Swiss-Prot record, chain A:
<feature type="site" description="Not glycated">
    <location>
        <position position="42"/>
    </location>
</feature>
<feature type="cross-link" description="Glycyl lysine isopeptide (Lys-Gly) (interchain with G-Cter in ubiquitin); alternate">
    <location>
        <position position="49"/>
    </location>
</feature>
<feature type="cross-link" description="Glycyl lysine isopeptide (Lys-Gly) (interchain with G-Cter in ubiquitin); alternate">
    <location>
        <position position="19"/>
    </location>
</feature>
<feature type="site" description="Not glycated">
    <location>
        <position position="45"/>
    </location>
</feature>
<feature type="repeat" description="Tau/MAP 3">
    <location>
        <begin position="8"/>
        <end position="38"/>
    </location>
</feature>
<protein>
    <recommendedName>
        <fullName>Microtubule-associated protein tau</fullName>
    </recommendedName>
</protein>
<feature type="modified residue" description="N6-acetyllysine; alternate">
    <location>
        <position position="49"/>
    </location>
</feature>
<feature type="modified residue" description="N6-acetyllysine; alternate">
    <location>
        <position position="33"/>
    </location>
</feature>
<feature type="modified residue" description="N6-acetyllysine; alternate">
    <location>
        <position position="45"/>
    </location>
</feature>
Swiss-Prot record, chain B:
<feature type="modified residue" description="5-glutamyl polyglutamate">
    <location>
        <position position="142"/>
    </location>
</feature>
<protein>
    <recommendedName>
        <fullName>Tubulin alpha-1B chain</fullName>
    </recommendedName>
</protein>
<feature type="modified residue" description="3'-nitrotyrosine">
    <location>
        <position position="150"/>
    </location>
</feature>
<comment type="similarity">
    <text>Belongs to the tubulin family.</text>
</comment>
<comment type="subunit">
    <text>Heterodimer of alpha- and beta-tubulin. A typical microtubule is a hollow water-filled tube with an outer diameter of 25 nm and an inner diameter of 15 nM. Alpha-beta heterodimers associate head-to-tail to form protofilaments running lengthwise along the microtubule wall with the beta-tubulin subunit facing the microtubule plus end conferring a structural polarity. Microtubules usually have 13 protofilaments but different protofilament numbers can be found in some organisms and specialized cells.</text>
</comment>
<feature type="site" description="Involved in polymerization">
    <location>
        <position position="150"/>
    </location>
</feature>
<feature type="cross-link" description="Glycyl lysine isopeptide (Lys-Gly) (interchain with G-Cter in ubiquitin)">
    <location>
        <position position="25"/>
    </location>
</feature>
<feature type="modified residue" description="5-glutamyl polyglutamate">
    <location>
        <position position="144"/>
    </location>
</feature>
<comment type="function">
    <text>Tubulin is the major constituent of microtubules, protein filaments consisting of alpha- and beta-tubulin heterodimers. Microtubules grow by the addition of GTP-tubulin dimers to the microtubule end, where a stabilizing cap forms. Below the cap, tubulin dimers are in GDP-bound state, owing to GTPase activity of alpha-tubulin.</text>
</comment>
Length: 49, 150
């Protein structure tokens, strides 16, 4: 007989962050909205016709 | 007691209203010497510029207050071209805000109309020409005329 055991394997496994996916509201934007209307439309020059 | 300066135009009409120690000669001479002053200028068509009232009774005052007694007093009522500067002030003050339509929504929210608002301003644009025409020295040709001296 040959004594000294057979063989036994270690428990060890590789690791990864799985390309995981979540929500982001901030990622959906790069630009701001244009301004409101700064201009008068009511004014009249009061000509006596 | 209207702040427009009476140098700025020409009298058309006057009423004097005396009370207390006044006699009618003294008044006739007060009026004639104001009439003489053509600096106290009348519209060049008016001849008989004055009306005159004379009461025997003096003004009494209220007791303890700011108004004190006199032996004689005068009120006066006078129509004059010089007030066309204050009507022009009421033009300019209207025109500056109405060009913007400022405060309009308060009046038009009582259902009053923008049409009537504009006619009121148009009636006062006619009023400016009403004061201006009485201000004309009865011109009826292409210039004016004079004798040797005024």
């Amino acid at each position: 007989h040959v004594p000294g055991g057979g063989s036994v394997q270690i428990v060890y496994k590789p690791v990864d962050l799985s390309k995981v996916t979540s929500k982001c509201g901030s990622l959906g934007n790069i630009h701001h909205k244009p301004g409101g209307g700064q201009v008068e439309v009511k004014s009249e020059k009061l000509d006596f016709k | 007691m209207v702040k427009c300066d009476p140098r700025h135009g020409k009298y058309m009409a006057c009423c004097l209203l005396y009370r207390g120690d006044v006699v009618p000669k003294d008044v006739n001479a007060a009026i004639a010497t104001i009439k003489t002053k053509r600096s106290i200028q009348f519209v060049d068509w008016c001849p008989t510029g004055f009306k005159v009232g004379i009461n025997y009774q003096p003004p009494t005052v209220v007791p303890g207050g700011d108004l004190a007694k006199v032996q004689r007093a005068v009120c006066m009522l006078s129509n004059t071209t010089a007030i066309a500067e204050a009507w022009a002030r009421l033009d300019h003050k209207f025109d500056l805000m109405y060009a913007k339509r400022a405060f309009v929504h308060w009046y038009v929210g009582e259902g009053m109309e923008e049409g009537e608002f504009s006619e009121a301003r148009e009636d006062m644009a006619a009023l400016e020409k009403d004061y201006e025409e009485v201000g004309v020295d009865s011109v009826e040709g292409e210039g004016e005329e004079e004798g040797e001296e005024y």
